[PDB]
């Protein structure tokens, strides 16, 4: 809608799933933990704003 | 076609609670030069500001000015979206928007993402790029008949677009509505009709056949083109 | 202007979203999971660099000087260490049209200075 | 499933394949010094398609010579011979680098319909 | 904002006069080639404020063959013309005893208005035109050949000469741009004269559908 | 008049056309068959050229019929060829260029 | 020519190259390099062509038009030239390289597929591979165009198969609808017509 959303087409599932939902389903609920796993350099706001829509879509 | 993104350098949303003391230091001159007289409803002001920075190169490449841009914004969104701007003299071409009266900041972000795509500053939609050039070949030059009776090929500027709006481009000042054409036969049929698309389709098939130096008798092209147009519509060979 | 980074709550470690306090007429960063709030210090909430004026020297890493497949030159000495040899390469990055520009890196170990002519 | 090929490793600007290896290879049938001893000596290496991206090849040891203007000067491997880029049927074409390439493809297809003796024990 | 508006109005009027002249309506040469400055003198150069209003641009021509066979050209003010406006124009045509009209809309026309234009055809043959498609006369395009509406006597002579039925001629849609320019309905035949690189000239005949 | 008709048919000055009879080759054939001497005065009356070309044009029929519609279609079918014929079999060209008998 | 391409490369590397209207800087650099190398190929081909004697059998067959062309002579004697894949120079199929034998970011003529040898001289291994790539493009084109062109042929035939010249000289389809009142607008067959000149036009 507002920005570019990241989705994940898992096997045996016929609907796209947000990546943040998959991360939480694996036990990583805090957004900090998820971006620790995704973004390894926190000095880089470009990656951050490009992942932000996915977080905003899964709250 | 030129959208606000094509001429924009960078956009940003600030939280400016009072325009008198702006967040940025270099925009304090023209903002106060604008605010010392009440031009709009200062009470109907929102603290969320949307500052866009233009670039002189793209502004000059289109002979565009902040006046036209601000007029286009105030027309597309009326008075609900206030816009202000400085003169075309500062080292940075900057103009500041606010919303007049979902939360406000999200609304500013949404209209930012929309204006940067749909706000047509200049040009005709669906026409991406245009190239002006002199045709060295006589097939695109302007062939006239001199007063002495000789054929003379005038070397004139012609434009080649990357999209087609024949309907609009024809109805433009200083555009030839007689020789201006297109290679999209469907638009020729929609704009000029069945005999126009018959002739244009003959021209395009001839161009495809002859580009490799080949030659086909014209009656074969004419028969194919009559087959595709004898029933009043464009009959595809399918 | 510069970009704006994401900031997280101090309790739930979720991202702080922007919010406005009418009472003080001031920007706040608040969590929509917990009930934490913070006084912003930048006042800028969003930044889009449409021009994409990115300094690709920041994207380069000195380790690239160890690449045997990169070209080396002795004509551009290093301004930081004075080493003669240096590897050079083009941007090869999308969203960069004028990408014939050359970026140089010093091959001296532990110097790793990067520059552009 | 990773397709790879053997290549000669290169020192600073020299091959590791010294003349002693060629000497031991010449008497291959006496001292049982084979290809595997060449690989075990660290003189030859199998490089796959994905590791070739990180490799700087010399087409011949002549490329390792110091030149008036050095092209690379930091090679890591060398071709055993460039003609090994061809397959079985293209390796029968004489002077394939003096033909138009479609001709070499048509021969590579037509060497397979050529008559000969397809196998020695054809009588049985 | 305003000079271009009057320019568009003048161009639309020029195309309309050319159209009426090609349909056979009595159009003086003076208005047939009216300069933009003359248009400003006769109507004004400030349409935005109300000089000229589009209601002042209304044209009323008479056929050369029949002075009683007149035709209107209306220029509605609203961009999207509604059924009420169509009823008003039909009322005016009834009062003035005129049976043909052109409506030069700006943005478009509502579905109910179009259905009204279609249902009452046997009473009033009133057509719909976009101002966008009247800013150019398409008949002047190089691709468009010379179209000529044949008379029923000419059509009968044609079918008797070539000994064929109307369904055997090639066709032209009733909604064709040139068919709409010439205001021709189903059952009419249009003679197209175009130059031919093999014969010099070629006449073909298309039946309207 | 034929010149102006050609000028509106071929708005670009391209005289290359595809037509039935190669009139220059037929004229050359006639020159060689009858041993025409290009240096001597000819015995061909220019009025004979005009009349003969007109009768020829009448004999070349693509559309048959005396009715006006068939007359106009016949005019159109052979227009370009008849222009080529009148400009090639002209009385002046037949008198000082081809010098036929 | 190779020094000219080196000069253009040095200009591009120093940002001393400005783009031309209608193209990006990459495309302008590619245009300049391709123009230089095409000029080199044409000049060398002209040199080879002028070197030929009247007894040359390539020249004999080209002159008669029996077989071959001047470009074939140029490729056999002078230079094979630039190999193109999809109308562009050899792509960087490796990481910023055309082959592992080149340095990264090498837009020179030999790196990107310019065969500076003739067929008599013989191609070098990289020239051999790039030439094989260019020839593979032609083989693919020849083998892939056939289905589409044949489908187009069948479609055209089935669309026009029953259109015929009738005894009233009109061209009509099976429905008896009139497609042309006279064939080719002139009622003439295409075997007997031929090229001529209108003497009163120009
Ligand atoms: Zn929180
Ligand atoms: Zn250094």
Curated annotation (Swiss-Prot), chain B:
Compartment(s) where it occurs, according to its Swiss-Prot or TrEMBL record: Nucleus; Cytoplasm; Chromosome
UniProt superkingdom: Eukaryota
Description of post-translational modifications: The tandem heptapeptide repeats in the C-terminal domain (CTD) can be highly phosphorylated. The phosphorylation activates Pol II. Phosphorylation occurs mainly at residues 'Ser-2' and 'Ser-5' of the heptapeptide repeat and is mediated, at least, by CDK7 and CDK9. POLR2A associated with DNA is specifically phosphorylated at 'Ser-5' of the CTD by CDK7, promoting transcription initiation by triggering dissociation from DNA. Phosphorylated at 'Ser-2', Ser-5' and 'Ser-7' of the CTD by CDK9 (P-TEFb complex), promoting transcription elongation. Among tandem heptapeptide repeats of the C-terminal domain (CTD) some do not match the Y-S-P-T-S-P-S consensus, the seventh serine residue 'Ser-7' being replaced by a lysine. 'Lys-7' in these non-consensus heptapeptide repeats can be alternatively acetylated, methylated and dimethylated. EP300 is one of the enzyme able to acetylate 'Lys-7'. Acetylation at 'Lys-7' of non-consensus heptapeptide repeats is associated with 'Ser-2' phosphorylation and active transcription. Regulates initiation or early elongation steps of transcription specially for inducible genes.
Function field: Catalytic core component of RNA polymerase II (Pol II), a DNA-dependent RNA polymerase which synthesizes mRNA precursors and many functional non-coding RNAs using the four ribonucleoside triphosphates as substrates. Pol II-mediated transcription cycle proceeds through transcription initiation, transcription elongation and transcription termination stages.
Domain comment (free text): The C-terminal domain (CTD) serves as a platform for assembly of factors that regulate transcription initiation, elongation, termination and mRNA processing.
Family assignment from sequence similarity: Belongs to the RNA polymerase beta' chain family.
Subunit structure: Component of the RNA polymerase II (Pol II) core complex consisting of 12 subunits: a ten-subunit catalytic core composed of POLR2A/RPB1, POLR2B/RPB2, POLR2C/RPB3, POLR2I/RPB9, POLR2J/RPB11, POLR2E/RPABC1, POLR2F/RPABC2, POLR2H/RPABC3, POLR2K/RPABC4 and POLR2L/RPABC5 and a mobile stalk composed of two subunits POLR2D/RPB4 and POLR2G/RPB7, protruding from the core and functioning primarily in transcription initiation. Part of Pol II(G) complex, in which Pol II core associates with an additional subunit POLR2M; unlike conventional Pol II, Pol II(G) functions as a transcriptional repressor.
Protein name, UniProt field: DNA-directed RNA polymerase II subunit RPB1
Native species: Cricetulus griseus (Chinese hamster)
Part of the full-length chain shown: 1163 to 1415 of 1970
Curated annotation (Swiss-Prot), chain C:
Keyword hit for Transcription: yes
Positions that bind Zn(2+) 2: 78, 81, 106, 111
Keywords: Acetylation, DNA-directed RNA polymerase, Metal-binding, Nucleus, Transcription, Zinc, Zinc-finger
C4-type zinc finger segments: 9-34
Subcellular location: Nucleus, Nucleolus
Main location class: nucleus
GO molecular function: DNA-directed RNA polymerase activity; nucleic acid binding; zinc ion binding
UniProt record, GO biological process: maintenance of transcriptional fidelity during transcription elongation by RNA polymerase II; transcription by RNA polymerase II; transcription initiation at RNA polymerase II promoter; transcription-coupled nucleotide-excision repair
Ranges annotated as spanning the membrane: none
Annotated binding of Zn(2+) 1, by residue: 9, 12, 31, 34
Classification via Gene3D superfamilies: 2.20.25.10
Name of a matching Pfam family: Zn_ribbon_TFIIS
ZnF bounds (TFIIS-type): 74-116
Cellular component aspect of the GO annotation: nucleolus; nucleus; RNA polymerase II, core complex
Complex and partners: Component of the RNA polymerase II (Pol II) complex consisting of 12 subunits.
Family: Belongs to the archaeal RpoM/eukaryotic RPA12/RPB9/RPC11 RNA polymerase family.
Protein name per Swiss-Prot or TrEMBL: DNA-directed RNA polymerase II subunit RPB9
Species whose genome carries this gene: Sus scrofa
Protein encoded by which gene: POLR2I
């Amino acid at each position: 809608a507002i920005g570019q959303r990241i989705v994940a087409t898992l096997p045996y599932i016929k609907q796209e799933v947000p990546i943040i939902i998959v991360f939480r389903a694996l036990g990583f609920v805090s957004d900090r933990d998820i971006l620790e796993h995704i973004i390894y350099d926190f000095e880089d706001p470009e990656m951050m704003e490009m992942v932000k829509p996915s977080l905003d879509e899964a709250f | 076609h030129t959208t606000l993104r094509k001429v924009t350098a960078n956009t940003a949303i600030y939280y400016d609670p009072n325009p008198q003391s702006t967040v940025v230091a270099e925009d304090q001159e023209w903002v106060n030069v604008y605010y010392e007289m009440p031009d709009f409803d200062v009470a109907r002001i929102s603290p969320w500001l949307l500052r866009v920075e233009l670039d002189r190169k793209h502004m000059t490449d289109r002979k565009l000015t902040m006046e036209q841009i601000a007029e286009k914004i105030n027309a597309g969104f009326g008075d609900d979206l206030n816009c202000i701007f400085n003169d075309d003299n500062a080292e940075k071409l900057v103009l500041r928007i606010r919303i007049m009266n979902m939360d406000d900041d999200v609304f500013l972000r949404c209209i930012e993402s929309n204006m940067l795509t749909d706000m047509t500053l200049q040009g005709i939609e669906q026409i991406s790029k245009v190239y002006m050039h002199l045709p060295q070949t006589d097939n695109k030059k302007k062939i006239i008949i001199t007063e002495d009776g000789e054929f003379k090929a005038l070397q004139e500027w012609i434009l080649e677009t990357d999209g087609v709006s024949l309907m609009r481009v024809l109805s433009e000042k200083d555009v030839d509505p007689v020789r201006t054409t297109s290679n999209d036969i469907v638009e020729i049929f929609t704009v000029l009709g069945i005999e126009a698309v018959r002739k244009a389709l003959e021209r395009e098939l001839y161009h495809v056949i002859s580009f490799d130096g080949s030659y086909v008798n014209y009656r074969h092209l004419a028969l194919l083109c009559d087959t595709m147009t004898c029933r009043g519509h464009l009959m595809a060979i399918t | 202007p510069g970009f704006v980074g994401i900031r997280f709550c101090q309790e739930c470690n979720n991202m702080l979203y922007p919010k406005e306090d009418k009472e003080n007429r001031i920007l706040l960063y608040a969590c929509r999971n917990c009930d934490y709030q913070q006084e912003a210090d930048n006042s800028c909430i969003y930044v889009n660099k449409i021009t994409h004026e990115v300094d690709e020297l920041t994207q380069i890493i000195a380790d690239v000087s160890q690449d045997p497949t990169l070209p080396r030159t002795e004509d551009h000495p290093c301004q930081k260490c004075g080493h003669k040899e240096a590897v050079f390469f083009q941007s090869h990055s999308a969203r960069a049209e004028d990408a014939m520009r050359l970026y140089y890196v010093c091959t001296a170990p532990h110097c790793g200075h990067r520059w552009t002519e | 499933g990773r397709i790879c090929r053997p290549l000669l490793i290169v020192e600073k600007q020299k091959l590791l394949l010294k003349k002693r290896h060629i000497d031991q290879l010449k008497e291959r049938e006496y001292n049982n010094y084979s290809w595997q001893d060449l690989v075990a000596s660290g003189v030859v290496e199998y490089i796959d398609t994905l590791e070739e991206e990180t490799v700087m090849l010399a087409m011949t040891p002549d490329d390792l010579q110091e030149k008036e203007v050095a092209y690379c000067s930091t090679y890591t491997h060398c071709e055993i011979h460039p003609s090994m880029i061809l397959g079985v049927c293209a390796s029968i074409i004489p002077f394939p680098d003096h033909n138009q390439s479609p001709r070499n493809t048509y021969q590579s297809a037509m060497g397979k319909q050529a008559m000969g003796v397809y196998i020695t024990n054809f009588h049985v | 904002d305003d000079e271009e508006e009057t320019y568009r109005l003048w161009k639309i009027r020029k195309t309309i006069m050319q159209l009426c002249h090609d349909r056979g309506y009595l159009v003086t040469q003076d208005e047939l080639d009216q300069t933009l400055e003359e248009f400003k003198a006769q109507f004004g150069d400030k349409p935005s404020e109300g000089r000229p209003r589009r209601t002042d641009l209304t044209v009323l021509v008479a056929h050369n063959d029949d002075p009683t066979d007149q035709m209107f050209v209306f220029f509605p003010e609203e961009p999207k013309v509604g059924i009420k406006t169509i009823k008003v124009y039909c009322q005016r045509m009834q009062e003035e005893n005129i049976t043909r009209a052109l409506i030069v809309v700006q943005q478009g026309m509502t579905p109910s208005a179009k259905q009204s234009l279609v249902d009452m055809a046997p009473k009033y043959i009133l057509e719909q035109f976009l101002q966008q498609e009247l800013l150019i006369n398409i008949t002047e395009h190089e691709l468009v050949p010379e179209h000529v509406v044949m008379t029923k006597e000419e059509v009968t002579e044609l079918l008797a000469r070539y000994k064929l039925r109307e369904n055997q001629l090639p066709r032209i849609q009733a909604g064709d741009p040139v068919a709409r320019y010439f205001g021709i309905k189903r059952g009419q035949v249009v003679k197209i004269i175009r130059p031919s690189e093999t014969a010099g000239r070629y006449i073909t005949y298309r039946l309207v559908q | 008049e034929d010149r102006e008709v050609l000028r509106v048919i071929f708005p670009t000055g391209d005289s290359k056309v595809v037509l039935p009879c190669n009139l220059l080759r037929m004229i050359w054939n006639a020159q060689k068959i009858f041993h025409i001497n290009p240096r001597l005065p000819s015995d061909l009356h220019p009025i004979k050229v005009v009349e003969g070309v007109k009768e020829l044009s009448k004999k070349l029929v693509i559309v048959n019929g005396d009715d006006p519609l068939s007359r106009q279609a016949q005019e159109n079918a052979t227009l370009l060829f008849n222009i080529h014929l009148r400009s090639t079999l002209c009385s002046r060209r037949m008198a000082e260029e081809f010098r036929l008998s | 020519a190779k020094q000219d391409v080196i000069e253009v490369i040095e200009k591009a590397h120093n940002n001393e190259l400005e783009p031309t209207p209608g193209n990006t800087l990459r495309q302008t650099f590619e245009n300049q390099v391709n123009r230089i190398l095409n000029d080199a190929r044409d000049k060398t081909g002209s040199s080879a062509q002028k070197s030929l004697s009247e007894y040359n059998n390539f020249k004999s067959m080209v002159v008669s038009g029996a077989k071959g062309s001047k470009i074939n002579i140029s490729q056999v004697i002078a230079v094979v030239g630039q190999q193109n894949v999809e109308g562009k120079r050899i792509p960087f199929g490796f990481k910023h390289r055309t082959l592992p034998h080149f340095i990264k970011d090498d837009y020179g003529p030999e790196s990107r597929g310019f065969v500076e040898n003739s067929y008599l001289a013989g191609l070098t291994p990289t020239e051999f591979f790039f030439h094989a790539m260019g020839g593979r493009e032609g083989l693919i084109d020849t083998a892939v165009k056939t289905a589409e062109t044949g489908y187009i042929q069948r479609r055209l035939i089935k669309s026009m198969e029953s259109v015929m010249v009738k005894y009233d000289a009109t061209v009509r389809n099976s429905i008896n609808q009139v497609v042309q009142l006279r064939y080719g607008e002139d009622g003439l067959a295409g075997e007997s017509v031929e090229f001529q000149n209108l003497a009163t036009l120009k």
